[PDB]
Amino acid sequence: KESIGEIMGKLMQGEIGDEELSKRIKEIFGKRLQWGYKPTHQQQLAFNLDFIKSLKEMDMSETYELPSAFLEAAFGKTIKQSGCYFKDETTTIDEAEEASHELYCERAQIKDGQTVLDIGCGQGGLVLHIAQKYKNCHVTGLTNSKAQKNYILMQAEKLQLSNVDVILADVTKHESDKTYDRILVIETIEHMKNIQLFMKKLSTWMTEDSLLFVDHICHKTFSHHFEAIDEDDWYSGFIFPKGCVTILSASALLYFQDDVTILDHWVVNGMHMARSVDAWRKKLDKNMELAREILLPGLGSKEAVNGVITHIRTFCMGGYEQFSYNNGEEWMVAQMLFKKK
C-alpha cells in the first residue's frame, strides 16, 4: 500500500518513468469506466438522468494566466488548448489546429458577414482564423483572462486584422443586450458550474437567425465530474481543482434544450484529442530547457518551475491514456449545433 503523497513525491521528482506513469493513469481511467457503465440501459439512463438532474440543482448555489512564451513552447502555432483534428499519421500540431478551426467553421455554418462570438476564446486561434478567412465577419472573443485578451489583440494587430474585439469578462457575470449571428463555445462548457443558466444566457445573445455551436470533451456513454472516485486516484485532483471540470456524456446537452433547440450532433473520436496531447507533450519535452528558462523569473524557484511543468506534462500523459482508451471510443469530443427556441 502507498499513499497519494508518496506517488506525488516520486512524480514531482521525475522518478516515475513514462511507462509506469501511463500504466497508473490508464488504471485510474479504467476504474472510471467501471464506475460509469451500468449493466442495463435502464440502469444506464437512471444513472445518467440522476447526473443531469443534479446539474440542474446547481442553479440554487485552473490558472489560465501562464506566460505566452511558455504556452508557445508547449502548444501549436495558435496555442489552441482544445482537441485538434489529425487527418494523417504525419499531421503536425499546426496543421491539426487549422483543420480543427476549419471543422468548427463548417459545422457552425460560418459565413462571411456574420457577427461571431467565441466564448472562452483562449489564445484566440479560432477568433483569428475566422477574422482572417472572413473579412466581413466581425469576430468577438470573450475571455476572463487579461493575458489572453492582450495576446489576441497583439496577434490581431500583427496579422492586420481589423475585425476582432475581445471582451474581458467572466461569461457567467457578463450582461449585454448585444446579439450575434454565431456563438461558438469550444471546450469552455466543461468549466460551467451552472449549465442550464449558461445555455439560457447564451440564448439571450441570439436572435431567430443565430446558431450556437458547442464543442466539449465527453464520454460517449456517461457523465462525470473530473475528480477522484477513491483515495487511489492521485491524478484527477492534481490536474483540476475540485468542482472545476465536468465531463458531460456525448448526449448530456440534449437534456439542456429549455432555451435552445438541437439541429445537429456529432462526436470526434478520442484519438484526435490523444494525438493533440501527445503533440503537446512531445513539443514541451523538445523545448524543456527553454520552458524552464521562460518560467523562472515569473515563478521564483526551479522547484516551482518543475511543478508547473510536471502539471502540464502529466496532463498530457494522462490525457493520452484517457482519450486513446479503446482506440478513442471512450472519451472523445462532442459537438452540437443549436438554434434559439
Ligand X SMILES: C[N@@+]12CCc3cc4c(cc3[C@@H]1Cc1ccc3c(c1C2)OCO3)OCO4
Q: Which three cell numbers stand for residue 102?
A: 476549419
Choose, by CB under 8 A, the member of 258, 286, 300, 302 that binds its own copies.
258
Phi first, then psi, for residue 116 (nearest 5°) are: -130, 130
**Binding string, residues 170-209; x marks residues near ligand SAH by CB under 6 A:** xxx-------------xxx--x------------------
User: Which residues are registered as beta bridge partners of 249?
Assistant: 219
- Does 65 help bind its own copies (rule: CB under 8 A)? no
Closest contact distance (angstroms) between CB of 167 and ligand X is 18
User: Which residues are registered as beta bridge partners of 332?
Assistant: 218
User: Which residues are registered as beta bridge partners of 166?
Assistant: 141
Give the max Cα distance, the chain.
62
Beta strands in the chain (DSSP E): 115-119, 138-143, 164-168, 180-186, 206-219, 224-225, 246-249, 260-268, 331-340
Q: Which of 105, 121, 218, 316 is catalytic?
A: 316
**Binding string, residues 272-311; x marks residues near ligand X by CB under 6 A:** ----------------------------------------
- Does 246 help bind ligand X (rule: CB under 6 A)? no
Spatial separation of the C-alpha atoms in residues 289 and 24, rounded to whole Å: 27
User: Which residues are registered as beta bridge partners of 262?
Assistant: 338
Choose, by CB under 6 A, the member of 187, 227, 259, 330 that binds ligand X.
187
Instruction: Give, to the nearest 10 degrees, the angle between helix 93-107 and helix 125-133.
Output: 70
- Does 81 help bind ligand X (rule: CB under 6 A)? yes
With CB cut-offs between 5 and 8 Å by kind, which of ligand SAH, its own copies, ligand X, none does residue 245 bind? ligand X
- Does 46 help bind its own copies (rule: CB under 8 A)? yes
Closest contact distance (angstroms) between CB of 179 and ligand X is 26
Q: Say if CB 267 and CB 220 are below 8 A apart.
A: yes
With CB cut-offs between 5 and 8 Å by kind, which of ligand SAH, its own copies, ligand X, none does residue 141 bind? none
* Total residues in contact with ligand X, by rule CB under 6 A: 9
- Does 66 help bind ligand SAH (rule: CB under 6 A)? no
316 labelled catalytic: yes
Q: Which three cell numbers stand for residue 63?
A: 490558472
Which residue, among 170, 162, 177, has the nearest Cα to 142 in the 3D structure? 170
Closest contact distance (angstroms) between CB of 213 and ligand X is 16
- Does 87 help bind its own copies (rule: CB under 8 A)? no
With CB cut-offs between 5 and 8 Å by kind, which of its own copies, ligand SAH, ligand X, none does residue 186 bind? ligand SAH
DSSP 190: G
Closest contact distance (angstroms) between CB of 39 and its own copies is 9
Q: Which three cell numbers stand for residue 114?
A: 456574420
With CB cut-offs between 5 and 8 Å by kind, which of its own copies, ligand X, ligand SAH, none does residue 69 bind? none
Q: Say if CB 98 and CB 326 are below 8 A apart.
A: no
The amino acid occupying position 303 is E
Q: Say if CB 118 and CB 142 are below 8 A apart.
A: yes
Binding site for ligand X (CB under 6 A): 81-82, 187, 190, 217, 226, 245, 319, 322
Binding site for ligand SAH (CB under 6 A): 64, 80-82, 120-122, 125, 142-145, 148, 170-172, 186-188, 191
Active-site positions read 316
